[PDB]
């Protein structure tokens, strides 16, 4: 019942805990199927609990690499991207000027619009009752709005909701106190639809099978449309890529800079994820490369991560003979998501996965903040490689 | 006092990385392309990418280096572009095919020391490395790559040269065979560009039938063994018995006009050419390596075929690791990282005095 392999000992899970995830349950089930179908281990960074119904509604588009402004995880703006980043999650408030500049550049460049924030009764009742992240609606006379408050740690910021109707949609327009006067709350909207965008699904890592390692696994830097045109040969490109060769705007929108640092494998797996999710033509949830290849990776912001593994990992001895099943050592929810809670648990998960022939891509920024550099080539060597070297040294008298 | 380099020079792919690592850092095609008509030469990924504006050449034919000028470009690209290392600062282990001419190992030793000035260098046999990658020093290896297939019996770290079998059929021939038999469906694949679509079809949809005859009958009476494949241009094609007929050529080389014996026959024949005392150790440690051994069902069919030829007393074991496409590289990484093995490398001092013959 214990996973023991070289210097790695994992005790089985005693009393499994329920982890509240922001990813909607049908999306976890899609990703568990994508993992089995493609034979890859897909890791996804956290999504806040309050973003679930927004993502599940399939109404909104999500933020890509051109919208670096963080989403919020408190107040009525929960799950949305405030233009004023002092209303976003704590990471954004740490370097407020940087994220405020990000918010403006995305809008002023035409990669997003400044949109109004409207919430329906369902979302208001969800924030007051379900999450208790908003206090009850109290009429402010001589204003006509419903006063509510939210917590920003040691701050209790007030918000005023005004009952309005748009396209016969009976909604609450969020208002705040901007420099003493009562202003409308602005959030970052999609450049084409003009509607507020939600947070995206960020791939943490994608562990591919060793037998499938190849040139597609090389992480590539964003090429300009001109550098890319010279790089490829027109006739070998599929119509999807020939279109990008003959449309600088299409390449700039679906490829190039928008993808970041990405492998050819991940560019294609992103399309498989998005198609499988029904998130297409502006509604995509995966926009770019993985945290594997992110120069600006913050390890603090990567947990809890949901990992989707090929179905054999769930079998009586999926991790190898006498090793056991992945559910025995890591929390696996009803949908098949292996919920990794911290860098130590991630390091252990990656070792078990490497041992079962799934290749890790290690980012050195993952080691920042860690007591020991867990994510290094030497530390993450395959136990089948180490065991073979020990056997060969013993046999050859070395 | 430095990391050793490992460079597996395959007919189709170069696998390069650092000794001590569990996988290579660079896996790229063994091709050099010169302008068809803004560099003078292009290697690996760049050459394949710019296929339409270059004349591609393969410097390694059937595991043997045939173009030394193009091979120098592949090696330069490996150190400077892929590994980003100074060749003169790392001892380098290179691989060679079984039965590699003595002059070929001398010439690559001459190039390693004269052209790249490596501090030290070692030349290992690919199949021997594969065995080490599975923690073994005795057994028989079937190494099937892109240009050549070999049967290599090994006893306590040493290959038995008299029992080495070379088979000139490998992955590349199976792709050409898949293009040929795909014509029997009304499909056409002729170009070098189209050959890569057929190579993808083969890797994703091919498998080895445990009973070829029964599989051909099943494919003839039902569409249960059929699979769909979407081409780049969006057109979806159907693949039927070609899924298992393509790797069947490994067992029945007469399929590609070859008067040769199948991989199972050559394995048995190689074991029979060895001492009766060590034959038990060879039957129980039959290791499979190379990309052409990646077909689902190849180990079950090998087990069935060898079992038929061997005495009923004899216990047969087929070892086919999931990472067996990289076994040769892994083996070299294991050997060159054993610091107790340091007393087995040819140094530049040894080369300067004795010349390229030191490698023997
Ligand atoms: N999954 C797969 N199924 C079948 N064939 C495959 C698969 N993956 C790779 N191959 C084939 O394996 C070959 C490449 O493998 P490999 O790295 O062993 O060759 P190599 O070292 O370049 O060649 P050689 O050993 O002949 O000099 C190609 O023909 C490729 O099509
Ligand atoms: N492969 C990559 N190459 C380059 N940049 C990348 C890559 N992967 C991620 N990034 C960087 O990391 C950022 C991902 O974070 P982002 O999605 O903007 O915010 P977040 O912390 O997930 O919060 P939200 O809830 O989405 O607001 C975007 C980009 O700066
Ligand atoms: C992804 C990949 C795989 C491979 O095995 O590639 C190697 C190297 C390659 C070189 C030419 C080609 C146009 C370039 C790149 C393909 C590299 O030739 C191969 O595809 C040959 C020809 S078709 C076949 O099955 N093997 C094998
Ligand atoms: Mg080879
Ligand atoms: Mn995000
Ligand atoms: Mn993102």
Residue numbers in the entry:
A (entry chain B): 466 to 863
B (entry chain A): 4 to 40, 49 to 371
Direct quotes from the study:
In the structure of Vn-ExoY bound to actin and 3’dATP, the electronic density and coordination geometry suggest that 3’dATP is coordinated by two Mg2+ ions. To unambiguously distinguish metal ions from water, we replaced Mg2+ with Mn2+ ions and collected an anomalous data set at the manganese absorption edge. The anomalous difference Fourier map confirms that two Mn2+ ions are bound to 3’dATP at the positions occupied by the Mg2+ ions, with no significant changes elsewhere. (B) The model-phased anomalous difference Fourier map from data collected at 6.55 keV, shown as a green mesh contoured at 5.0 σ, confirms the presence of two Mn2+ (grey spheres) bound to 3’dATP in Vn-ExoY NBP. In the active site of Vn-ExoY bound to actin, 3’dATP and 2 Mg2+ or 2 Mn2+, the K533VnE-LID side chain is too distant to potentially coordinate the ATP 3’OH moiety if the latter were present.
ExoY virulence factors are members of a family of bacterial nucleotidyl cyclases (NCs) that are activated by specific eukaryotic cofactors and overproduce cyclic purine and pyrimidine nucleotides in host cells. Here, we explore the Vibrio nigripulchritudo Multifunctional-Autoprocessing Repeats-in-ToXin (MARTX) ExoY effector domain (Vn-ExoY) as a model for ExoY-type members that interact with monomeric (G-actin) instead of filamentous (F-actin) actin. While Pa-ExoY requires actin filaments (F-actin) for maximal activation, Vn-ExoY is selectively activated by G-actin in vitro. The catalytic domain of NC toxins can be divided into subdomains CA and CB, with the catalytic site located in a groove at their interface.
